C-alpha cells in the first residue's frame, strides 16, 4: 500500500530546469523498482557504486530523486568526474556518488513549433558547484574589470540562457528528461527497502 511515489517523479506532467533542479525525498515506503525494469522506453541507464539487480533486496535510510531536463549532448555529463556547463554550473555529482542516472528523450513533450524556451541553464558562474548544490541566483555575471552593479552590458551578462527546443532539432539538441536516484545509508533506521 505504502509504495514509494516514483510515479509522480517520472510521470510528472512538467519538469524543472537543470539549474533549478527539483529534489524529492523518498522515505518510509516500500521501494518497488519494477517500474525501471519493465519500462524499456529509457535511452540512457547508468548506475554507479551499486547494481540495479541487487537493489530490490537492499534497504536504505533515505533515497533522493533529483529531476531536471537537459539536451542529449549533455546527458553524458550527468556522472561522476565529468566536466562541462551542466556538470560545473548546474548539477554536479560527487566522485564517490552511489546511485543511478536515467535519461529519456522527451522531444514529444518539451518542444514547441515556435521553440520551447521555458527550460533554462546557467551559463556563467564565478566558481564550480559543489556536489548536490542548487544555485538559483540571478546575479549579473561580471566578466570584465568593470564591476556590474546589477546592470547588464559590456562584460555584464545575465547568467541564465534558455534552451532552443524545436521538433526538428538534432538528436544531440533534443530535450531529455533526467532522473537521478541517490541512496544514502547512515547509522540510523532504514525506512526505504526493496
Amino acid at each position, epitope marked *: 500500500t505504502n509504495l514509494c511515489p516514483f510515479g509522480e517523479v517520472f510521470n510528472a506532467t512538467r519538469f524543472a530546469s537543470v539549474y533549478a533542479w527539483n529534489r524529492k525525498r523518498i522515505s518510509n515506503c516500500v521501494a518497488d523498482y*519494477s517500474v525501471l*525494469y519493465n519500462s524499456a522506453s529509457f535511452s540512457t541507464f547508468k*548506475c*554507479y*557504486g*551499486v547494481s*540495479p*539487480t*541487487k537493489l530490490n533486496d537492499l534497504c536504505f535510510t533515505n533515497v533522493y530523486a533529483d529531476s531536471f531536463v537537459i539536451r542529449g549532448d549533455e546527458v553524458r555529463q550527468i556522472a561522476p568526474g565529468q566536466t562541462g556547463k551542466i556538470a560545473d554550473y548546474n548539477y554536479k555529482l560527487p*566522485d564517490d556518488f552511489t546511485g543511478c542516472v536515467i535519461a529519456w528523450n522527451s522531444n514529444n513533450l518539451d518542444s514547441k513549433v515556435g521553440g520551447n524556451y521555458n527550460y533554462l541553464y546557467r551559463l556563467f558562474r564565478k566558481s564550480n558547484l559543489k556536489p548536490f548544490e542548487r544555485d538559483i541566483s540571478t546575479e549579473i555575471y561580471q566578466a570584465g574589470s568593470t564591476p556590474c552593479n546589477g546592470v547588464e552590458g559590456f562584460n555584464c551578462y545575465f547568467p541564465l540562457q534558455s534552451y532552443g527546443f524545436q521538433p526538428t532539432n538534432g538528436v544531440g539538441y533534443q530535450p531529455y528528461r533526467v532522473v537521478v536516484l541517490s541512496f544514502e545509508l547512515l547509522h540510523a533506521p532504514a525506512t526505504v527497502c526493496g
Partner: antibody
Amino acid sequence: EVQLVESGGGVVQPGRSLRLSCAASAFTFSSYDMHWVRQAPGKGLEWVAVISYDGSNKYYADSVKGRFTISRDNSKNTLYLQMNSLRAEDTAVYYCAKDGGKLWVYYFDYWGQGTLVTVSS
Amino acid sequence: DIQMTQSPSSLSASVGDRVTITCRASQSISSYLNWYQQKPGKAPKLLIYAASSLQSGVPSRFSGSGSGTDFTLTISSLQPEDFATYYCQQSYSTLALTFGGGTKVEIKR
C-alpha cells in the same frame, strides 16, 4: 564444485542469428545474477550482458544494445543468449559467469570454459 | 567511458620473485577493482575482488591493494603454476564493465 558449460557456438554469416546456452550445476542458479563475457581472438575480455536472478532485469553494454538478448530458464537451470544481427566485431569466445553477490557491485565468481562464435559467410 | 591501463604490458620474472602488477583507472573507483588470471587457452579464473579480498580457494601468496585509481597486485613468492596473463577489471561503472589490457607473466629467460 561449480560447473558452467557453454554450447551453441559455431560459424555464422553476418546479419544472421545464433543461440548460445549455458548449463549451470551444483549451485542455486535461480538465486544469482548471471553474466556473459566475450573475448575476441587475440584481444581481451569484454563485458556483454547481465540478467537478474529472477530473470526480470536485463542489461547490456552499448556495443550490442538492441542487438543481443539475454534470458534464463531457472527450471532447467540454463542461461540463454540470443545473438541477432551478428557483425564481424562479434567474433569471439563467449563465457557464462556467476556473480557471487557478496558486494554492492558485480564481480565474476566462476567461469565456464566458453564457446567459440565466428562471423563469416 | 572508463579505460583501465594495466602495466607493465608484459614483465619477465623467475620463480620465487616478488611479482607486482599495477593497474590504473581513468577516473576514481572506490575499491571496486578485481584481478583475474587466465592461462593460454583456458578460461579466466577469479583471484581478487574488492581490491584486496582473496577469493576462496586461491593461494595466500596473492594479495591486492590500492584505492582510488592506482591498484596493485602482488605475488610474494612466484610459483611455476602462476605463469599466465593477469587482467584487472573495474566495476564502479556497473553497467559499463571494462577490462584492462593485461600483463602476461612470462618465464623470464
